[PDB]
RNA sequence: GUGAACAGCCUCUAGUUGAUAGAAUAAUGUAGAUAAGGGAAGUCGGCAAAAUAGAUCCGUAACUUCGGGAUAAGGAUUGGC
RNA sequence: GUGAUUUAUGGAUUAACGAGAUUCCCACUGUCCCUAUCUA
RNA sequence: GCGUUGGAUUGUUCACCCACUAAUAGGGAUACCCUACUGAUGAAUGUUACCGCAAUAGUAAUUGAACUUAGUACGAGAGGAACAGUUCAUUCGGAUAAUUGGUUUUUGCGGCUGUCUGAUCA
RNA sequence: UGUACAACGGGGUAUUGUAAGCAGUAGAGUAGCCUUGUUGUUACGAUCUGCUGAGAUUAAGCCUUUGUUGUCUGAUUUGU
């Protein structure tokens, strides 16, 4: 595919990207419940 | 030149080759769609008939 | 391809648009458009300018530094083109921009909260300083 | 030196109709089924395209290269009637027309010229002639089955299905390149009040001919008309006159795409994976949207935007490799041409700008 | 076009008429050129023969070593100072006009180069590609 | 669009850069060599009297003395305090 | 040893590149030079149709060894991806950011040691030793500053342009650690990096390369089983 | 007011609002302008257009009937609080 | 007669000046490659 | 059938060089007024409209270079085309505004000097 | 007398480049009522910082419209 709406993927592409996605999944799991997005 | 006999017949044998066969298969390929369009509109007409 | 950004604006120069100017010091300045091109010819300073992005990310508007911003730096190490990582990166990049939108909307809110209090204070200045329209109505 | 002009298109006058009229067709082949020889739609704007290149031997083999295309609105096209034509020692002769028992308001509005004051009585006797039996119709049809070595069909567009508002339908005649003229008219009779795609005539990896009328430019004199220098009478002495609005014919036109209205993400290559139709930001420039099929062809057709064109399927069996190469798109620019466009989608606009004062 | 020029040239914009001064990017110490001529010329009335990147000229040296001055020798253009279009989609330009000296065959006169050369001339002339320190 | 743009800011009259002058200030040896540039007859100031900050060759000492107490030198010496704006922040300001 | 002709040019190492574990080739014209290489070597190692920013010149815009490989800023993600997909993952691949890009012009390298410009940056000078494990030196040859153009190296031997004096020859043979010869290729073509290419078990040269030239390179690179 | 000014620009006192009008923007003309890249190659011919031009600091050769040439050349500077 | 100066169809010379005549150097630029646009 | 150049030199055509390209062959032939040429409407054909035919007239494409064949046969070698397959390019013509660059009364948006409406604003 | 047509308005695109109105413990500085500071505070003060990618413009030969408000029967000529 090599392309998205923007910021084409070869600057994104590495392994452990799902691990990073979980590393941010926990972060949004923190901030969703704190009322920060009021 | 465009219109020299040598380049011309040398192009005619090649036209008799791969290109006309590609076109002869292309016309059957597109005749398939050209005929099934009638079927699509006719099943729409069946949805009208019911 | 690349969507390589404007040297002067950090704005995306899609393929076909703009200019790649290349100096005696053998460095490309790929440009979004003529406006930014003529300004760079004119030796303007975007950090001083207000419509650009270097100034914005320097000036305490939307955060320059974060991991959601920094996930996409570069890769000078190719990765052998497996399919199954890409099958998930397509969702990763999708959700990253959603969370980034949420974060920067929250940052705009962090910049623009306390606006209604000063709005009411200026309107209170108005109603206290002009009670004559209140005699009228 | 050369002559500061051509001589072929010498009576440089305006044409008589904006419909550039088909004059040539490739002859026939009476072994195939019927294939329509032409089609027609309305030019809308231009875009830019990059394309990975399977051209064996060329300098740009297996490379990305940017090129430039046009786009035309190509709705489905309904058939309304036929005509026959017979060889004489004068030329050809229209000997019968036959129509298709129910006609749209659009074509009834074409044949009339001041619509709303009209009683719109266009075919009210013809539909009455379409009796319980269609006797006179079959009379004047099997005649053509006997005679009429070559046969054409009438078409009209569905122009209400375009962003454009003219309300009027552009007739034409179209030649066939099948055999068995009885089968031709039988096919067409079944196709009466039935409509036809553009992916059912054309496909990718194709060459076409584009015949249209140019943009007008008024009465420009010699220096910009012929590109001649600046400080009895012969007809080639580069005298001023009307430019533009001539008919022309442009050939060897490589299609890249045969679009589809129902297909969402018409701008999608295999590469982008973005749900965007090719209608870019801002709408087209003096044309609207593309919610129908379409064509993406390289070069630049004669015309201006929101102008009609007619299409022909290259009129002979081409010989160049470029007539047979295999196309593969990599990316459609989808930016607004109402300015130096930067952004494909308004969601990308939101993403790169952020939220704003009017946003909340 | 001449000998040595492997591959064909694709059409580019044309910036350099005759009488157009340019830099000498060589390591001989020669400093400038003054074009008089082009090889691969078009034929038309009242024209100025144009040169561009990848092209090969005959020209003088107006400033450089005196042994080479008041003498004519060939040259290749290396920097255009005018905007062109590589098909892999981008417009670009270098700032300055520059041309280096070389024999009629295509072999480079000097042994080294200062500054950037265009992708076109680099791809075209292998001895440029061997003696050049830079690409773009 | 006009005459001032083309009479000051064409591609024949360009300055050296903002960046290389910053790196020249950082590097000790560079200002030494730039001051010890020898004579050349092909300049009016004859290959000397070069201001490092304002990259121009004056012809005498008074054109340095009056130039240093001026509003043009203020510009360069104020801009050379902060960051020299290389391509890094241009990359950085949109998530690169 | 074999002479070989690119399309009508005798200079090979401007249009192609070699290592002990793989080989590169441009895609200019027709697929005959790749067949020419595989006629000698075969499927012992990968031979790869490759490009650099759509350019034909890989032989002078690239530098590497059997341990690792380097490419300049101008190259593209597509070419980098294709290089890793084509080549085994045993060898490194890496894209470099510099002011100047003429890597094969300015790197004459073999698997253990390589030479570079004096003004090359110390960042990439560290990185090349990091990726290849090779000792780096920043020198010239007879004042001729392009090192990757006028030198061709191997672990068997090497070569330099003929104008080098003998003091330069010996003091460079010290640094380079193989026997050297101030030699020629194609009737005195000064550009030896492009005029010929060499690895520990093959050399390739233009058709104009003569029999004395073949003999001296054959001896110095010790290529047959009787040298 | 401006600024050296009785140059030019704007304004108050005072006086005209007269010059056949209207609708349309096709060329070419007439006056006025801008144009990349090169920079007099064009042309009999630097014809015309265009370049610096104002004020201060330094500085200004040969030649001379010593009186000048000289706004010589040429470099820097010019806002507001 | 002749036209300042040094030294009489008048001889060698000459600073300044001339809407006096000729060649060339700088920059300048649509004179030109190559023409394009806009305004009353 | 299609093409035949850029410069250098004289009021002068006489005279004769440099370099490119495939070549840079020789010759001839005030003006609104009526005509010719370039373009534009137009009643009459019982009407008005749509689609088409095509008597006739004009006619445009050109050249070089290159991968392969092929370092082929031939030649002792130096040297070396070829036919076919394939790609580019030149000069000409016709279109087009995606993109780039040029253009500004969008007088759209800012900014500026002097001045006028007391000052800001506009 | 409608899949209607238009005049405005909204939305989309783009254009420029961050408005009037204020507020500040930024603001070289000079005076200043004297609570004689030890950021004394008060005066002026080019500008800077924030409400502000803000403001204005947008078809006259751009896109889009379930909004509002109006128009929707004037003259003439024609026959085998
Ligand atoms: Zn920008």
Swiss-Prot record, chain C:
GO-annotated cellular components: cytoplasm; nucleolus; preribosome, large subunit precursor
Main localization category: cytoplasm
Molecular function GO terms recorded: ATPase activator activity; ATPase binding; structural constituent of ribosome
Gene Ontology biological process: assembly of large subunit precursor of preribosome; positive regulation of ATP-dependent activity; ribosomal large subunit biogenesis
Cell compartments where the protein resides: Cytoplasm; Nucleus
Residue ranges the record marks as coiled coil: none
Keywords (A to Z) from UniProt: Cytoplasm, Nucleus, Phosphoprotein, Ribosome biogenesis
Protein family (similarity comment): Belongs to the eukaryotic ribosomal protein eL24 family.
Function: Involved in the biogenesis of the 60S ribosomal subunit. Ensures the docking of NOG1 to pre-60S ribosomal particles. Activates and recruits ATPase AFG2 to cytoplasmic pre-60S ribosomal particles.
Subunit structure: Associated with nucleolar and cytoplasmic pre-60S particles. At the end of biogenesis it dissociates from cytoplasmic pre-60S particles and is likely to be exchanged for its ribosomal homolog, RPL24. Interacts (via C-terminus) with AFG2 (hexameric form); the interaction is direct, recruits AFG2 to pre-60S ribosomal particles and promotes AFG2 ATPase activity and RLP24 release from pre-60S ribosomal particles. Interacts with NOG1; the interaction is direct.
Protein name listed in UniProt: Ribosome biogenesis protein RLP24
The encoding gene: RLP24
From Swiss-Prot, chain E:
Places the protein is found: Cytoplasm
Family of this protein: Belongs to the universal ribosomal protein uL14 family.
Residue numbers carrying N-acetylserine: 1
A single Gene Ontology CC term: cytosolic large ribosomal subunit
PANTHER family: 50S/60S RIBOSOMAL PROTEIN L14/L23 (PTHR11761), LARGE RIBOSOMAL SUBUNIT PROTEIN UL14 (PTHR11761:SF8)
Assembly description: Component of the large ribosomal subunit (LSU). Mature yeast ribosomes consist of a small (40S) and a large (60S) subunit. The 40S small subunit contains 1 molecule of ribosomal RNA (18S rRNA) and 33 different proteins (encoded by 57 genes). The large 60S subunit contains 3 rRNA molecules (25S, 5.8S and 5S rRNA) and 46 different proteins (encoded by 81 genes).
Residues carrying N6,N6-dimethyllysine: 105, 109
Residues forming coiled coils: none
Further facts: There are 2 genes for uL14 in yeast.
Lineage: Eukaryota, Fungi, Dikarya, Ascomycota, Saccharomycotina
Organism this protein belongs to: Saccharomyces cerevisiae (strain ATCC 204508 / S288c) (Baker's yeast)
Protein name as catalogued: Large ribosomal subunit protein uL14A
Curated annotation (Swiss-Prot), chain F:
Region (Nuclear export signal-like (NES-like)): 17-31
GO biological process, one term: ribosomal large subunit export from nucleus
Zinc finger (C2H2-type): 49-73
GO cellular component term of the entry, any: preribosome, large subunit precursor
GO MF annotations, alphabetized: nucleic acid binding; ribosomal large subunit binding; zinc ion binding
Endpoints of the signal sequence: none
Function, as annotated: Involved in pre-60S ribosomal particles maturation by promoting the nuclear export of the 60S ribosome. Involved in positioning the proximal bud pole signal.
Note: Present with 5630 molecules/cell in log phase SD medium.
Protein name per Swiss-Prot or TrEMBL: Bud site selection protein 20
Portion held of the full protein: 1 to 96 of 166
Swiss-Prot record, chain G:
InterPro entries, sorted: eIF6
Primary location: cytoplasm
Lineage: Eukaryota, Fungi, Dikarya, Ascomycota, Saccharomycotina
Nucleus is among the record's keywords: yes
Entry protein name: Eukaryotic translation initiation factor 6
Organism: Saccharomyces cerevisiae (strain ATCC 204508 / S288c) (Baker's yeast)
Residues with PTM Phosphoserine: 173-174
Subcellular localization: Cytoplasm; Nucleus, Nucleolus
Miscellaneous remark of the record: Present with 18600 molecules/cell in log phase SD medium.
